[PDB]
Amino acid sequence: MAHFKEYQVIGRRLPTESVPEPKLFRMRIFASNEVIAKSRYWYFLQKLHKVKKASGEIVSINQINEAHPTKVKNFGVWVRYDSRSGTHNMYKEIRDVSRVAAVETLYQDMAARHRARFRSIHILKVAEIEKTADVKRQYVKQFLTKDLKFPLPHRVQKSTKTFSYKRPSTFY
């Protein structure tokens, strides 16, 4: 759906005389803007509670920024999604530098591997994996080995003119 911000969203059903001060519920929501974010909120509250937007109210909406945006983190990611013929729960692991970055590559991944558009996905949880070795998926374990190094073979430089007088070299 885009480049994500993450939002705390807080709502409640409207007050009534016999029930002033209804309970107040919160969701974290990944969206490109607060309009999609409040929308998503109402979308999930209605899967959980007797409410809808006409009888509820948004109390607060705030963007949550990453605590340590230049610290590499190992994310565990938990998703529900629909396929062409059923619906399915999934656990993935994503290594990045923010929840927000991490969720972008998730949708990308879900679109690429499983052909799941944004409508078909529910993020259930995004959590930082504190101890390496609770890291489960090998496509990440791979990047945790000590003194890790790797070359980038077959370098291909972008030409800026249509003709060239050399004959390139993919050295690196």
């Binding site: 807080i10 409640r12 001060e21 309970k23 107040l24 519920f25 919160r26 969701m27 974290r28 999930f44 509250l45 899967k47 959980l48 109210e57 109390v59 938990w78 529900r80 619906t87 399915h88 729960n89 529910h122 993020i123 259930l124 949880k125």
Partner: protein, 159 residues
Amino acid sequence: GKSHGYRSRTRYMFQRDFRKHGAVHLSTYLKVYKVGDIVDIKANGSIQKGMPHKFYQGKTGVVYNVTKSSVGVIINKMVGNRYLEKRLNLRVEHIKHSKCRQEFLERVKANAAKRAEAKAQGVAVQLKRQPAQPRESRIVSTEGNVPQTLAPVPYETFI
């Protein structure tokens, strides 16, 4: 071939309401109609004399005549691109006083009052109705009510 008699297609319309068959209660006959009164029209299937045609079921018109066992109701019916005036002879069993008017009569009688209550005092009234307005600001407290965080829930089968 086709069939289109008078009471055609009216099986459920003129039907009688669950556990409400039999004699009509006497209040239906004690009610009183005057020319000008506004009435709703709905057929009592157990009262074959003086029945509205089904076109007029659900319809609301004005009394123009009062007769021994009936009232004459004028309904405006639209045919082609125009309305024509229609006059109905209905027995009192197929009619009731419409409340389509009380909110008005009740509002008038009230509107006079707060106008007196103003004038006599020194005006500042404002007595047209107004649509739902949007909500004003408000401050919701957290005390006793910290926000509960919910997330979406996994797929599951039960069956």
